[PDB]
Design a protein around this ligand. Structure first.
Ligand code: CHL
Ligand code: CHL
Ligand code: CHL
Ligand code: CLA
Ligand code: CLA
Ligand code: CLA
Ligand code: CLA
Ligand code: CLA
Ligand code: CLA
Ligand code: XAT
Lengths: 213, 217, 230, 212
């Protein structure tokens, strides 16, 4: 019925299409156990959401570099920001783990005991941390515009859109790393080269990806 | 039901009515040291003595430290005061400590026998008529009587509130002293001097840059 | 049944024409939630009302005071009250006005009474449409007037954004830019000064200075999203 | 749960039930819920009066002496900043005066506390037993010899409200003296003159930005 990653192959039993972005792709049966599948569903969303922020940030700053606004490449921004602004790297790293540790520990114990973070313990907030589904916090803090509290049909459509752009972003972030390692240039520097001579400038001719070439 | 970590499973032994009668019970016992009811009764006394001793000691390091900086006093660093005091002293530190162990040992011994047999120090004739006031109260670790001159423990409404304040300030004081010890080795300066340095440049003067705490970085 | 932004289309379910200026335009469904629409209703009026006043001011400034560029009016203006003296009055006065308006949005009918004078009070009204002292004179039907207000207001909001991007690109005022368009309409469109094709991208230069020196301090003055310009 | 008829610090805001207008100056202001417990709120009620009444005296004792000096009135203590009165030399050393202060205050304060603990129990003169305060006095409002002019016999409720309003403003003023003196480095009335000289360019934003 519903489309699958490999046309003609029946989907796995444990993937019934209820989840967003379900194409029955689980060749290694990593999520056969129902409780483990909940953990990975949220792991995919967190991975996808971070990748979308990463890809958008890398793309935008790369446009700034090409246009000449002075932005550094994503693989040099860390060094430039610290030196130019005179920031102690170990202090910045520690601050990150306090803020991430607090925010991400709360997400951890909401997964273990759903609704536990909405008991008013944290500064008296009792409804912004209740959670709607697994991986979808909802609420008037994480969803201020209430797009998850309006139409039910369109909210399900967005869940499909979120996961697929997340998976695409995850692949893109792997492309940025692989392209930098093979080429040593920025993302849009590679795109400009390909558009110049697509036939003679690509991975099959970089001298790295296909060593036998 | 306040807990140190929302959404975690409170240990069963800490949810019993006897356990919840203890001040400062936030369900924090990950290592299960209080599973045995007899042990928890003993560890509660240890916390109270550590709490009260730490508060007195920290007050003796912090308040003199601030007044010394303000210029109202001249007291050496808490880690030097021992050497300074013994110089202009009537006794060597060996004699001073030996007396301390007799007096503290005698007083501690009476407290010890009350933990084993609550109210047993009011044995008629045991002391020179003063045993009557050494019976303590119905709650272990809260002697009262001569130890409560102002009678602040006779107000039932405020009783639970008072005990919570003591344990909270006591736990904070215990951590403060551990910070004094760690900050002396880490920074080689006084507690108040460390605070002054942090406030001057918080983002560059902290444990992340002291060159000790994070050896890998 | 009523005119729509795209004739022949079906308006979203949450839009039914009750509000003024309701032409059924909500492709993203931001107004689906009832409470969210109530807040977004207030912000549209406030945004539009500010824009209409701002757009009118910029046009009047250029006619009355052609030399001064409305973009540079921040530093050009000189007054005895000084920079921080003006800001202090603005902050406290705006904080009072905005909080009272905000309170009515949360709990309507609670901030109608005049604090100082007891006798004066605001008659019952709808959120975002205060009456009484604020509306001494009404030309005609309110229902028609509300539609007129939003339609002019929505146009003004677009108009102001036009001033900013035209000011940043052409480095001129609104009327001055228009005179340039009438002089050479073919050679002055955004298409005739910018273009991007595979392999090449040409964008106009930001004509606003990178930084502004104002009374011993440097104020950054960046062109809005200059890196994504066509 | 607080009724809407009572004055509110923030019109149209829900306010705590336990602030029901009994105390003077009850505008329902308690965002931190400090006074939620009735026992604690009983203590805080007296603390506000004590901190307020001393503040009113202190502020009066910091402005009037400086105001007279500017007018030209001459007395040996003239021209001394409120934060330099301690250094000034008097007929007796500061330590001796301090010792007398605590002994005198120990008697009156414990007398005041005894009434608070058990109202009406400290209304009799220990020496001249004939003397006595009226039996209807409440904690914080002794009356009797403390009200020789009988003002308390009038609209008492309004007077209590007026006292706390002036008192609360006085407490804020004293905090202004410490903040202003610590920052500006000059006497309070000097700061007012500077502000009146150029109100627009003499805000705390102007003053503090210049320093850093
Ligand atoms: C017995 C001690 C004890 C321990 C070990 C913990 C441990 C924890 N508590 Mg805590 N609690 C403890 C006692 C208590 N907790 C609580 C109530 C809570 C709540 C309500 C919550 C926690 C949470 C947490 C977790 C935070 C994880 C993290 O990354 O934090 C990172 C830590 C911080 C961000 C704060 C500390 C930062 C830094 C060390 C101090 C900086 C101070 C400066 C003034 C900073 C100024 C900076 C400004 C100026 C820019 C962690 C497992 C949170 C959690 O994860 O819940 C699921 C949580 O929500 N605890 C109470 C009150 C009943 C306690 C009473 O004793
Ligand atoms: C609706 C408000 C508003 C807008 C849209 C502008 C817009 C502009 N001003 Mg103007 N101003 C505004 C209000 C004011 N300006 C000034 C004073 C100035 C000066 C002195 C200068 C400008 C300049 C400019 C231009 C470039 C600004 C820039 O890139 O800043 C980049 C961004 C910043 C500098 C900071 C951005 C702040 C942030 C958006 C809001 C911060 C909120 C506050 C923390 C909240 C507290 C304050 C209170 C009032 C709410 C631009 C046309 C410059 C110019 O002429 O360039 C050619 C210039 O030199 N403005 C005052 C008087 C105090 C204002 C009062 O409301
Ligand atoms: C409401 C209570 C209260 C407050 C807020 C102050 C506030 C102040 N008193 Mg004052 N006092 C108060 C009650 C009293 N004072 C004094 C007696 C003094 C004296 C004798 C002095 C002050 C001084 C000071 C200042 C301390 C800061 C400073 O410059 O240190 C720096 C300190 C100095 C430069 C003084 C150095 C010489 C001095 C003889 C050394 C000994 C000082 C004492 C330790 C001060 C003890 C004050 C305590 C009891 C409040 C400050 C303005 C000092 C002052 O006016 O400095 C300009 C000062 O010398 N107060 C008495 C006793 C009658 C009080 C009784 O309640
Ligand atoms: C998780 C994703 C992510 C991460 C780790 C970074 C990390 C960084 N970004 Mg990027 N960025 C991202 C997403 C991200 N960005 C996205 C989604 C966008 C919008 C499309 C941007 C737009 C952006 C711009 C325009 C700039 C950066 C810059 C920076 C650098 C400094 C950040 C800073 O000082 O913030 C501090 C910010 C706050 C405290 C406020 C929040 C740093 C390397 C700066 C840079 O590269 O400077 C050389 C810079 O100019 N980022
Ligand atoms: C656990 C508690 C504790 C301990 C073990 C110490 C230990 C020490 N203190 Mg510290 N101190 C403490 C608490 C403590 N203090 C507290 C709570 C305060 C008040 C904030 C102080 C204030 C303080 C000062 C101001 C000074 C010390 C000093 C000393 C030294 C001993 C002085 C001496 O010979 O006294 C011998 C006398 C006694 C033990 C009998 C008590 C005598 C006092 C005056 C009675 C006061 C009664 C009071 C008014 C009621 C020694 C390093 C001195 C130091 O460091 O010298 C180099 C010093 O100058 N302490
Ligand atoms: C959003 C509104 C707004 C803002 C922020 C500004 C800002 C500015 N205008 Mg502009 N202006 C506006 C609207 C605005 N104008 C409108 C609608 C008109 C048409 C009437 C004008 C007509 C105008 C002229 C003719 C001039 C300016 C000038 C100026 C500059 C100096 C102002 C000054 O010195 O005032 C000093 C202030 C006073 C003398 C007292 C003003 C008291 C007013 C009238 C009270 C109004 C209260 C009322 C409730 C407001 C309702 C609308 C509001 C909520 C938006 C400054 C950049 C000057 C300039 O170009 O300088 C380079 C200049 O010459 N403006
Ligand atoms: C005051 C410091 C400062 C300076 C000098 C710049 C400078 C720049 N920014 Mg950055 N930016 C800043 C702060 C600053 N930014 C802050 C605080 C934010 C978070 C609100 C951003 C968010 C931001 C974005 C999202 C983008 C830029 C971009 C740019 C570039 C083009 C100008 C533009 O569109 O700005 C826009 C800046 C604002 C609207 C906020 C200015 C606040 C002062 C330029 C190099 C653009 C670019 O070319 O990126 C590659 C771009 O897309 N900035
Ligand atoms: C909280 C109340 C308070 C306190 C603690 C003080 C304390 C002080 N006042 Mg102030 N004063 C106060 C209220 C207070 N005043 C009030 C309400 C007024 C009426 C406006 C004054 C008027 C006043 C004057 C006019 C002077 C002082 C002075 C003094 C100092 C000497 C006091 C003395 O020996 O008086 C005398 C002792 C008895 C009356 C007993 C001392 C620092 C003197 C000073 O600072 O000299 C340098 C000084 O000249 N006070
Ligand atoms: C009783 C209240 C009160 C009053 C009337 C003043 C008056 C003054 N203060 Mg002071 N101040 C106060 C409280 C007060 N202050 C408090 C509580 C603090 C501690 C935070 C300070 C800290 C302070 C500093 C650091 C400075 C001043 C300065 C000033 C001047 C005005 C310019 C300024 O920056 O103000 C800033 C002051 C405030 C924003 C006050 C906020 C808090 C009060 C309680 C608000 C009351 C509002 C209410 C409607 C009543 C208004 C007054 C009333 C008589 C009508 C002026 C002489 C400046 C000066 O000396 O310039 C030469 C200056 O540098 N004040
Ligand atoms: C008593 C004390 C300090 C006393 C200090 C004194 C007298 C100082 C005196 C002096 O300084 C003066 C005044 C002046 C100086 O000149 C001289 C000296 C002499 C130096 C500190 C205790 C300090 C005690 C500390 C820090 C104890 C911390 C315990 C922790 C964190 C336990 C945690 C858990 O056990 C739980 C609760 C439950 C389990 O399930 C899980 C785990 C995690 C195992």
């Amino acid at each position: 019925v519903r489309p699958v990653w490999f046309p003609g192959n029946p989907p796995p039993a444990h993937l019934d299409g209820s989840l967003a972005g379900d194409y029955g792709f689980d060749p290694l049966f990593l999520g056969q156990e129902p409780q483990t599948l909940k953990w990975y569903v949220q792991a995919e969303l967190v991975h996808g959401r971070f990748a979308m922020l990463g890809a958008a940030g890398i793309i935008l700053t790369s446009i700034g570099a090409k246009v000449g606004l002075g932005f550094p490449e994503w693989y040099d921004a860390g060094k430039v920001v610290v030196e130019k602004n005179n920031i102690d790297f170990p202090t910045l790293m520690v601050i990150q783990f306090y803020l991430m540790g607090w925010a991400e520990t709360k997400r951890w114990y909401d997964f273990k005991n759903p609704g536990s973070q909405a008991d008013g313990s944290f500064l008296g907030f009792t409804e912004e941390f209740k959670g709607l589904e697994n991986g979808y916090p909802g609420g008037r803090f994480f969803d201020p515009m209430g797009l998850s509290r309006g139409d039910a049909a369109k909210y399900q459509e967005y869940k499909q859109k979120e996961v697929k752009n997340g998976r695409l972003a995850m692949i893109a972030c792997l492309g940025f790393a692989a392209q930098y390692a093979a080429t040593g240039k920025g993302p849009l520097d590679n795109l400009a080269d390909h558009l110049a001579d697509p036939n003679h400038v690509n991975f099959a001719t970089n001298g790295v990806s296909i060593p036998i070439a | 039901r306040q807990s140190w970590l929302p959404g975690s499973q409170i240990p069963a032994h800490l949810d019993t009515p006897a356990a919840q009668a203890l001040a400062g019970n936030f369900g924090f016992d990950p290592l299960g040291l209080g599973k045995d009811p007899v042990a928890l009764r003993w560890y509660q006394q240890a916390e109270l003595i550590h709490c009260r001793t730490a508060m007195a000691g920290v007050a003796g390091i912090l308040i003199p430290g601030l007044l010394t900086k303000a210029g109202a006093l001249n007291v050496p660093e808490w880690y030097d005061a021992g050497k300074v005091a013994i110089e202009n002293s009537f006794a060597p530190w060996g004699s001073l400590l030996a007396v301390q162990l007799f007096l503290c040992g005698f007083v501690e011994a009476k407290r010890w026998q009350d933990i084993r047999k609550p109210g047993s120090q009011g044995e008629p004739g045991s002391f020179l008529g003063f045993e009557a006031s050494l019976k303590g109260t119905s709650e272990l670790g809260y002697p009262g009587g001569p130890f409560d001159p102002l009678g602040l423990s006779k107000e039932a409404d405020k009783w639970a509130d008072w005990k919570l304040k003591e344990v909270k300030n006591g736990r904070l004081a215990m951590l403060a002293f551990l910070g004094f010890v760690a900050q002396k080795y880490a920074t080689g300066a006084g507690p108040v001097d460390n605070l002054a340095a942090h406030l001057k440049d918080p983002w560059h003067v902290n444990y992340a840059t002291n060159g000790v705490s994070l050896p890998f970085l | 049944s009523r005119p729509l932004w795209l004739p022949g289309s079906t308006p979203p379910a949450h839009l039914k024409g009750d509000l003024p200026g309701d032409f059924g335009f909500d492709p993203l469904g931001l107004g689906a939630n009832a409470e969210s629409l109530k807040w977004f209703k207030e912000s549209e009026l406030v945004h539009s009302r500010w824009a209409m006043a701002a757009v009118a001011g910029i046009l009047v400034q250029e006619i009355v005071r052609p030399d001064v560029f409305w973009y540079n009016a921040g530093k050009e203006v000189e007054s005895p009250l000084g920079p921080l003296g003006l800001l202090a009055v603005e902050f406290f006065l705006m904080h009072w006005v905005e909080v009272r308006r905000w309170q009515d949005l949360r709990k309507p009918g609670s901030v109608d009474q005049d604090p100082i004078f007891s006798q004066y009070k605001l008659p019952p009204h709808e959120v975002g449409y205060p009456g009484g002292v604020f509306a001494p004179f009404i030309p005609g039907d309110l229902a028609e007037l509300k539609v007129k207000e939003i339609k002019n207001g929505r146009l003004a909001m677009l108009a102001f954004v036009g001033f900013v991007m035209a000011a940043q690109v052409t480095g001129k005022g609104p009327i001055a830019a228009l005179q340039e368009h009438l002089a050479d309409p073919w050679g002055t469109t955004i298409f005739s000064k910018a273009a991007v094709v595979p392999g090449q991208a040409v964008a106009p230069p930001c004509k606003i200075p990178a930084s502004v020196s104002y009374k011993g301090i440097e104020i950054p003055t960046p062109c809005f999203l200059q890196g994504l310009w066509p | 749960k607080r009724d809407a008829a009572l004055p509110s610090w923030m019109p149209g805001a829900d306010l705590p039930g336990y602030l029901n207008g009994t105390l003077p100056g009850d505008f329902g202001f308690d965002p931190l819920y400090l006074g939620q417990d009735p026992v604690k709120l009983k203590w805080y009620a007296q603390a506000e009066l004590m901190n307020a009444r001393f503040a009113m005296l202190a502020v009066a004792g910091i402005l009037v002496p400086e105001l007279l000096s500017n007018i030209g009135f001459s007395w040996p203590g003239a021209g001394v900043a409120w934060y330099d009165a301690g250094k000034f030399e008097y007929f007796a050393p500061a330590s001796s005066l301090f010792g007398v202060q605590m002994l005198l205050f120990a008697w009156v304060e414990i007398r005041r506390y005894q009434d608070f603990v058990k109202p009406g129990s400290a209304n009799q003169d220990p020496i001249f037993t004939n003397n006595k305060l009226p039996d209807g006095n409440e904690p914080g409002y002794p009356g009797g010899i403390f009200d020789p002019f009988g003002w308390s016999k009038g609209d008492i409720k309004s007077l209590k409200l007026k006292e706390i309003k002036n008192g609360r403003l006085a407490m804020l003023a004293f905090a202004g003296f410490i903040g202003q003196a610590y920052t500006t480095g000059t006497t309070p009335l000097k700061n007012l003159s500077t502000h009146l000289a150029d109100p627009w360019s003499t805000t705390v934003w102007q003053n503090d930005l210049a320093r850093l």
